[PDB]
Symmetry: D2
Subunit: 257 residues, 4 copies
């Protein structure tokens, strides 16, 4: 089938990429970066995120694979030494799917996030009303908010005090960035975990300009009327070759390897 390989760009990743293309050439495998069925990322989790967004319009037809040439990643979770075994088994596997986060920006534009989407103010203070399923929940004032996917909970969400969720749970998690809490403003404080079909809506109070991020991309959006978050109906599909449990991936990354 058709495949493509993206590289971090350094010497180690480019050389491993050319070795895998050479190995794939020994099989009935066609290199195609327009309509591939297999997308292999060689580098780090950031390289994988770029590979994800490069082909986010054909997610239903692609199985992703991440190879880490540096430290272990949560998406790039295979070592370079296993690359030849990867080529062989790719040539002849199972698939697993992770949930995604859909962000809607109304002035509308839509985006998919594999890790998270965050909102911060343009320059002045950040004040938004948080609406959950069309009911006003809180008026947040602080540095910003972060809405994370399950596989994203080990990233920005973790540094903000959020919980780590197993990626088989179809949910999204909202966490706060340095909220003010006194006799005036009151926020929930705790991270919030929302199931599928729940819609979390951010609405401006005064300033309507916001710095909105989706994974690595960050854009200053002007004249924003609303930001809608919900668990996406689309999922990202990984090629699975052996058992690397998520909790073991957490242990190896944060406890010790």
């Amino acid at each position: 089938m058709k495949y493509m390989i993206t590289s971090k760009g350094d010497e180690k990743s480019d050389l491993l990429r050319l070795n895998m293309i050479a190995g794939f050439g020994e099989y009935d495998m066609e290199y195609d970066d327009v309509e591939p069925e297999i997308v292999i990322s060689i580098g780090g989790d950031g390289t994988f995120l770029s590979a994800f967004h490069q082909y986010e319009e054909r997610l239903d037809e692609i199985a992703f694979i991440g190879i880490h040439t540096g430290h272990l990643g949560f998406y790039a979770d295979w070592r370079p030494a296993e690359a030849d075994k990867l080529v062989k088994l790719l040539a002849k596997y199972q698939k697993v799917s992770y949930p995604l986060l859909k962000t809607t920006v109304k002035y509308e534009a839509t985006y998919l996030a594999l890790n998270e989407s965050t909102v911060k103010s343009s320059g002045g203070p950040f004040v938004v009303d948080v609406v959950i399923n069309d009911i006003h929940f809180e008026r947040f004032r602080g540095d910003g908010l972060c809405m994370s996917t399950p596989s994203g909970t080990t990233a920005y969400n973790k540094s903000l005090g959020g919980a780590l969720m197993h990626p088989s749970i179809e949910a999204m998690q909202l966490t706060e960035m340095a909220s003010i809490n006194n006799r005036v403003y009151r926020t929930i404080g705790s991270p919030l975990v929302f199931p599928k079909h729940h819609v979390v809506s951010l609405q401006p109070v005064n300033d309507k300009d916001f710095q909105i991020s989706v994974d690595h991309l960050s854009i200053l959006h002007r004249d924003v009327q609303e930001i809608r978050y919900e668990v996406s109906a689309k999922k990202i599909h990984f090629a699975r070759f052996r058992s690397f449990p998520f909790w073991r991936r957490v242990h190896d990354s944060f406890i010790e390897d």
Copy 2:
């Protein structure tokens, strides 16, 4: 059908209980506290928890209802003024189910928790190995651990920094109590959210005596070899009469009412 009413014991709850029994008497309703189909709790969330554990052997055949005579509760979420309307509609509704936590103590004994189950040391230091699906995850040293149900996340879990999960998500959440983290002991720190069929196992390192709690009940268990946590196959069934969304219940309890 058969019903029973439990009371907090104070004058307000006992008087409301006798008024509801009198109202139920005007219908084809039989008071029975042995095999009831309807269990009404009048008091607080603690009164509801006692009502839950009193009939935990017939959960599949009971619809629970909570009336709060004090402040709003997450289980006792109906005001005394609605009691007469409750009697009428009970006489002729829909049902909603929340997940439960199964705790297994091997020396074995099993328990169901509606809020959470916690483990603390008998007297000396608390050290346990945390095993997730038969793989060693961390060696925890600290004050204790708390495993929460979704509806329990707004209780002890919240005070420990855990996330608030909508009760439609079949999961359990583990949080830490004052863990040591230095060049010796290392814990994950973040709360962990586990899906159904995941088994979290606590195993002793030196001391084998532990103070184990399940909701309000707390027992000193001796010669403990293992404590197993998993999302229960059983669920608690609530009688539903109108929409009181969980997130609104969170807003009314923690933001303002």
Copy 3:
């Protein structure tokens, strides 16, 4: 003696300012906004912060006073109804002094902060080496860092998890903003409280552009070689007329009033 009054600008503050000037005119008091001995702020804590920085070059010769026309402030801690009594007693008091934070930016420029000084990245990732008294302490990667004065601990420092310090303690407190902590980057996590004469130095790793804030002012600094923090030798002097203990000010602002 000479005095001046600054106003938030709204109708309530301007009208109270003109009433106090009229009351001061009934005494031997000279309005002077060039070399005043008394600086009265009417508005909120933000109005007071602007009054502080307007006269930061004559701190040793000025007694500050804050009047809150909205909610209680930690610097604007006197109600408008007490303004006439303030005029009388000003005309004939004691003084109390709070510590300040000195920030040095080397490319050098120096700044005084009454609340705090923060460092965030220009656009990309924020990575700095933290040096305490000329010894490397940690390599911080995250959103930013905040160094707070004692009276500033109830402001940005509090939202970041820092401790509240009584302003009689000559110290500064450093807190983290969403730090990464895994098998690569390692930060202390806890807030750090430094005494007088301790020098905390932030040094760039790759990017040398930083968004540096001092109280309300925020400047993008380019080609930064170092940022030095230390407890200032200067202090801000408040005119004291009665006992409003700091801990009571904390209770009234955060517990209830």
Copy 4:
């Protein structure tokens, strides 16, 4: 002068203790465990804490020294290889003093803490009114409270989210253990740092039995009317032989060594 050596009890500590006594015998040094001027602890920080409380009645006349036979401690901060050099220099140094915490239990009894003093309930719920300098600050409900010395901030205080304070600051820090915060109970949440002469008083609401700890000692106190915390007028004196800065001790223990 007179000296004594306490040992953890294991083979390594006892053997090092006998070697130091033999080395001290080659000088005009008298072993005395009744009225020593030098108290050497060989083991861990726990061994040092026991050595501190064994001679807490002669703190003004004793210089303490800690040797760690295991991992580095904050009080036992000298390696066994330096023991012979310690004997020589002891025979002929400077002294440094750390602040202590005085706990008063009224039914009265007084205690000194080098690390911290904590309060937890006897069995039921823990509810106390927190009084700061004779003014009611908050009604705390939760697992307990911890009042830490500066050198104690790296111990229990750190695991509870408190700040790390340099031990030259004469202060005490109060932190919360899992407090309830809703529309009923309200606590400050943040750690509180109190200067000298400030008195923090814990007063019972219903239950008058409390589990009170001071460093390693923990006693169930009955019929408690009040618990008073204040920075002690006494200090612990360490023998200083070279520079091991506190912040370096923090870096070596928590960042890496």
